[PDB]
From TrEMBL, chains A, B, C:
A GO cellular component entry from the record: plasma membrane
Membrane topology: Multi-pass membrane protein
Catalytic activity: K(+)(in) = K(+)(out); Ca(2+)(in) = Ca(2+)(out); Na(+)(in) = Na(+)(out)
Organism: Ailuropoda melanoleuca
UniProt KW keywords: ADP-ribosylation, Cell membrane, Disulfide bond, Glycoprotein, Ion channel, Ion transport, Ligand-gated ion channel, Lipoprotein, Membrane, Palmitate, Phosphoprotein, Receptor, Transmembrane, Transmembrane helix, Transport
One annotated GO molecular function: extracellularly ATP-gated monoatomic cation channel activity
Localization terms from the record: Cell membrane; Membrane
Function per UniProt: Receptor for ATP that acts as a ligand-gated ion channel.
Keyword flag Cell membrane: yes
Name the UniProt record assigns to this protein: P2X purinoceptor
Any GO BP annotation: regulation of transport
Residues included from the entire protein: 31 to 350 of 594
Main location: membrane
Length: 320, 320, 320
């Protein structure tokens, strides 16, 4: 008859383990993000084989755009080009783009890595180098890598503040991430201060374990997962988040798969009543706020059906 | 034997009410938003202690950007600054920025509220006021509040149209918000017209109960929740949405937590072959369309398992 | 006694097919999209009744913006206007905008289709036509349709690459779309190459079944659904996606419902120290990546409860 008891204990254990007496529903989320911290740039780069110095200050209206769909981007490196205008000009001489005669390359060709429409006419590029030029924005951008020192090497010193508002539509519950009367100043830590949401990017990378400068050179994507494990029962009610970080990139390191994160952006203006654009190749770190969770409440129907299921189980256990 | 009959009524009630004979699956959504209504601005503001008049017209391409990830933003108030250019200039004199001696403040300091890198050199700012200047965009913006009258005071007269398309991947079902042959002209009302989705922002606030001007001055976030309670059974088939609204903000009213919604935006240009930006501090209302819902079809497996698990409930009650 | 066996066969069939021994949990996703392929524009349009020629090249930084919240936009057609500036100017002559006397139209009117604030003063517009002018951007844009040939007629020749990274929070599992050591060069096909994610816009339209030119003229929204049916049990483990394509639009073709996809964009500049904006009316194809899927692992509790539920189901059928 002791066996008749043991299953009962197991049953209770199972219930207490997973709250089968709790109708559970998914989560609806709203995220608001504020990034603060100014950056100083001062370094020496090279363009067209000529050295130049770049200096300036970025004031959080310059190196990012407002949050849109749970993803706020943070600039870390750039390659500049100015004076682009519509015309014909020789393309950056590569193996596929080199020629000695106009008949070498065909007009209208669209090489995947070429940024201009080819007219099939080989012309001298520079110092007796011959390539068949393209009709595009000119002068053509030189395809190189981002400068080895981080142009915004002070990126990890920034601070991001996150306000998360969760609501469950089944139950009548909506609550925020920050409760009234909380510590304003913070620096998020796993154990020292695990609740206030002020994140330092250096802290994020230290938790992840990667080198911030290396992935900042080529850009990358990561995510700040927010876990809401809330119980709505009055007897034991607690609804508090847990923060985790994870690198969302793959570290492919293959040229064909576009390693890291980067894009191209254009600024237009009028010079001498002529349209002229300047091109910025931006490498950055893209943060995602992946908030997920479940919320449940005591419900009679789930308890009844689970008891009905367990009844036959222990009846059979007694039978055999 | 009546006790053997009350369980039948209870089980039928539960099965009919919660629809246990249905395979409930989540929802996949697509949202498309169009905002229409022009606005006129005409007011008197003050900059550097001098009064100026601002007037103009915004044409639904000037005060918003296209929908991106279920969130379309609407401008409400702005603070302007022009002639920004790289240099060194005294910071806006506050308690943490004032100084009387050169050694008063240290070079390289980055105050959280200061927008420039501090070089630690106390210089006269204006009428014998001394602060240690910063090397940044100049002249420095004056941190003030948004003007008490709403610069976009005619914001609540706008009209927003929402087209929602839901698909369930389990079942072969996809349907839209607007059925063919429906009233074009509308103004959404709780009871007068509860289905056509033309929303007025003033009505949006009126349903919530908050004053439009107060939230508009400092900005805020609210949600337009769309609830799809659809049943796919042929006998009782109805799939129509219900519209609800809520304020997603917190009303913190604390300076340290950045009350309301605002951001900073820049427009670059060339003046005398010199880079010059102009800065806009934007306060606005960011709308979110938080769509959720469930749907299910009749399934033999769910009905069979529920019947098998509910049989023991009366099988035992007969014994006792 | 065979009836005792048919129920066992049915139970085993249901358990194997629908996987009752699994703890099914939702999916968390991250998407990274790269669009490549240059476009050339060369055509003849008409503005103000005068013919003009438009030519140029778009280089994947001109006709799109970076991915933001699972939606990347692609240019396909545009209408240009330049020289806009704040002032008073006659509105485009329509039925609601025409007048013969000043008292005919009342000041302050806001017609839904009018883009300017009306001052109620009938003035000559062009060759003895009379309309009451509006205080707005000038000269007023002429409301027309997009040019019948596709300005971005080569749009279907572009290539889009998609990197999807999924994680399940319940189990300790995260995986990406592309496995190491895969074919780089690709063109997606239903049967020839169904796994590598390089998509051609012409290919996806062909799979959908609609012509590219007609949809591109007025714009539309379609989704790239990615389905992850992953099983985490070690015995039979396979986590590979299935690609499906669908058109998210409605084909309303009604003027009041804004058929197709389009918006208005502005570029600002300074000419003769006067602010002057230029307006672009954009018709484009907005792509969505609607990712969804489920995954689960072997769990003792689900197996136990399902057996306890089916025990009564077979026991009662044994009785009768
Ligand atoms: C890419 C983000 C910032 C971008 C950038 C990059 C390099 C620069 O120096 C070379 C810039 O000038 C100083 C800027 C200016 N901003 C303004 C904010 C901004 C916002 C954007 C964007 C680009 C920019 C560039 O794409 C969509 O949303
Ligand atoms: C912030 C939204 C509108 C912005 C703005 C603010 C103040 C102004 O008075 C000087 C503006 O001129 C009339 C404009 C013009 N637009 C164009 C649309 C637009 C779109 C944006 C944006 C800013 C703007 C500014 O940030 C990302 O997406
Ligand atoms: C609307 C997308 C592209 C837009 C456009 C339209 C017409 C043009 O001439 C015909 C343009 O010049 C070549 C451009 C340039 N870009 C840069 C990228 C871009 C990005 C955007 C945007 C507009 C543009 C315009 O709205 C928010 O995000
Ligand atoms: C409710 C609250 O914030 N209490 C205290 C606050 O008074 C104090 O300034 C801060 C110092 O870190 O610690 C916390
Ligand atoms: C199918 C349909 O739209 N029917 C009518 C429409 O004819 C009428 O113009 C409108 C007036 O509000 O009411 C509705
Ligand atoms: C692992 C791998 O990619 N193997 C081959 C690759 O070597 C080859 O270049 C390609 C040709 O399409 O087919 C594949
Ligand atoms: C970050 O800030 C700390 C102190 O504020 C400073 O010591 C450190 O050098 C900074 N790092 C960078 C990369 O600017
Ligand atoms: C909104 O519009 C109504 C009528 O169109 C007008 O009476 C009212 O004054 C307007 N409100 C604002 C703030 O412009
Ligand atoms: C697309 O490309 C193919 C081959 O690259 C070419 O034959 C075809 O004409 C192109 N279509 C357009 C519209 O440019």
């Amino acid at each position: 008859w002791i066996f008749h008891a043991l299953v009962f204990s197991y049953i209770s254990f199972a219930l207490i383990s997973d709250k089968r007496y709790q109708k559970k529903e998914p989560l609806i989320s709203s995220v608001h993000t504020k990034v603060k911290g100014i950056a100083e740039v001062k370094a020496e780069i090279l363009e067209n084989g000529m050295k130049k110095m770049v200096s300036g200050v970025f004031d959080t209206a310059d190196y990012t755009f407002p949050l849109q769909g749970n993803s706020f981007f943070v600039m870390t490196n750039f390659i500049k080009t100015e004076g682009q205008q519509q015309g014909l000009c020789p393309d950056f001489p590569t193996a596929r783009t080199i020629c000695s005669s106009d008949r070498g390359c065909k007009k209208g060709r669209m090489d995947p890595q070429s940024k201009g429409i080819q007219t099939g006419r080989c012309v001298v590029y520079k110092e007796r180098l011959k390539t068949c030029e393209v009709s595009a924005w000119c002068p053509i951008e030189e395809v190189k890598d981002a400068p080895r020192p981080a142009l915004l090497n002070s990126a990890e010193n920034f601070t991001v503040l996150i306000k998360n508002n969760i609501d469950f539509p089944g139950h009548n519950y909506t609550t925020r991430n920050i409760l009234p009367g909380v510590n304003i100043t913070c620096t998020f830590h796993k154990t020292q201060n695990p609740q206030c949401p002020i994140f330092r990017l250096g802290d994020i990378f230290q938790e992840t374990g990667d080198s911030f400068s290396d992935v900042a050179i080529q850009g990358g994507i990561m995510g700040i997962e927010i876990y809401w494990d809330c119980n709505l029962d009055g007897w034991f009610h607690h609804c508090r988040p847990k923060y985790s970080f994870r690198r969302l990139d793959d570290k492919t390191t293959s040229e064909s798969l576009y390693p890291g994160y980067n894009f191209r952006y254009a600024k237009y203006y009028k010079e001498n009543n002529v349209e002229k654009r300047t091109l910025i190749k931006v490498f950055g770190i893209r943060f995602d706020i992946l908030v997920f969770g479940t919320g449940g409440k005591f419900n009679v129907i789930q308890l009844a059906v689970y008891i009905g299921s367990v009844i036959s189980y222990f009846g059979l256990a007694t039978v055999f």
